[PDB]
Design an enzyme around this catalytic site. Structure first.
Site, PDB file in Angstrom:
ATOM      1  N   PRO A  58       0.842  -1.211   0.000  1.00 23.45           N
ATOM      2  CA  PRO A  58       0.000   0.000   0.000  1.00 23.45           C
ATOM      3  C   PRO A  58       0.866   1.245   0.000  1.00 23.45           C
ATOM      4  CG  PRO A  58      -0.541  -1.453   1.856  1.00 23.45           C
ATOM      5  CD  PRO A  58       0.753  -1.939   1.274  1.00 23.45           C
ATOM      6  N   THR A  59       0.432   2.273  -0.723  1.00 22.70           N
ATOM      7  CA  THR A  59       1.139   3.560  -0.786  1.00 22.70           C
ATOM      8  C   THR A  59       1.271   4.260   0.567  1.00 22.70           C
ATOM      9  OG1 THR A  59       0.131   3.825  -2.971  1.00 22.70           O
ATOM     10  CG2 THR A  59       1.434   5.677  -2.147  1.00 22.70           C
ATOM     11  N   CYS A  60       0.388   3.925   1.513  1.00 27.77           N
ATOM     12  CA  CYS A  60       0.489   4.487   2.863  1.00 27.77           C
ATOM     13  C   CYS A  60       1.713   4.002   3.649  1.00 27.77           C
ATOM     14  CB  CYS A  60      -0.788   4.237   3.665  1.00 27.77           C
ATOM     15  SG  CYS A  60      -1.153   2.484   4.012  1.00 27.77           S
ATOM     16  N   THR A  61       2.289   2.907   3.202  1.00 29.70           N
ATOM     17  CA  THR A  61       3.406   2.324   3.853  1.00 29.70           C
ATOM     18  C   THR A  61       4.701   2.703   3.232  1.00 29.70           C
ATOM     19  OG1 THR A  61       3.710   0.139   2.840  1.00 29.70           O
ATOM     20  CG2 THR A  61       1.933   0.438   4.314  1.00 29.70           C
TER      21      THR A  61
ATOM     22  N   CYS B  29      -5.373   1.751   2.701  1.00 32.86           N
ATOM     23  CA  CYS B  29      -4.317   1.526   3.640  1.00 32.86           C
ATOM     24  C   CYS B  29      -4.840   0.459   4.565  1.00 32.86           C
ATOM     25  CB  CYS B  29      -4.020   2.800   4.421  1.00 32.86           C
ATOM     26  SG  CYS B  29      -2.590   2.586   5.453  1.00 32.86           S
TER      27      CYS B  29
END
EC number: 1.11.1.24
Lengths: 174, 174
Positions: A58-61, B29
């Protein structure tokens, strides 16, 4: 350690799918190419190789991958890097889709490789145990110049850390 | 054979990420949930399970998966299917991304599972040897009613064949 020894290619091989002009922003009908690590290294004087735990993380990570993409021009143009190889244990089709989602339009100098069953990654001790005899790649980076490892480091916590595997850490060594 | 015998759940577990209302057309997320096959089967009276070799298989190649997505309404509304589980050995993030690319906006009744290391799939003999001790899932489909397998079949050539694993073949058995 690996540093200052010849790149330990062995008989290990990787797979990737190409991205180019036409299929950059559309859907490819392309089967994977298989490439021996020894051939890649024999044909390119300067190679960066970097492991990632999971395509579509995920891009949040936290990730080191976008950095390599952002910095590709400088790597190829100013720092004379022939190849940047991003390594996962994920299937080549998923790796390619992932590359495109990240903005890759041309694999001339950057390729998203499958290391099937983590075999190469396990062989240099850079794997990430996830349970039950299953292995993903850890987060790590390596510089190979003229067939010789001049830098190799993996993160202690691939989950949370982008330090020694970052494009910046690597830039200091090229 | 498996047919007419209780679903052999063992201790096998799978992972998936949910898709819903908000994150359907954007970036989640979300970390993977782990679910035991025995729990899934205990909690749902009617379950379809279908294996696929590779997340992001090119659209130019044959696939039974779009069929299941197209037919999901009829499966859930008219045929009372509680769950459709699409099984690959790929990481759960890649599986989710794949689902969204295929048009899944809601995982209430359809989940894209990882069978890590092909362990569950190997256990029922429905795996696909790809080389060097590495296993993908084959192309197959299974119907479990009230904890009992009432249909199970895999393709002879997953590369080229969509017959016994098709949603149509399965419909005839529900």
């Amino acid at each position: 350690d690996l540093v200052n020894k010849k790149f330990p290619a062995g008989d290990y091989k990787f797979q990737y799918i190409a991205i180019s002009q036409s299929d950059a922003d559309s859907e490819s009908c392309k089967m994977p190419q298989t490439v021996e690590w020894s051939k890649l290294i024999s044909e390119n004087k300067k190679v960066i190789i970097t492991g990632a735990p999971a395509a579509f993380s995920p891009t949040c990570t936290v990730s080191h991958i976008p950095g390599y993409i952002n910095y590709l021009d400088e790597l190829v143009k100013e720092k004379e890097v022939d190849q940047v190889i991003v390594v996962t244990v994920d299937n080549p089709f998923a790796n390619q889709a992932w590359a495109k989602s990240l903005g890759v339009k041309d694999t001339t100098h950057i390729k998203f490789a499958s290391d099937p069953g983590c075999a190469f990654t396990k062989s240099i001790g850079f794997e990430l145990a996830v349970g039950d005899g299953v292995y993903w790649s850890g987060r790590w980076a390596m510089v190979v110049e003229n067939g010789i490892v001049t830098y190799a480091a993996k993160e202690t916590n691939p989950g949370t850390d982008v330090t020694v595997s970052s494009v910046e850490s690597v830039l200091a060594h090229l």
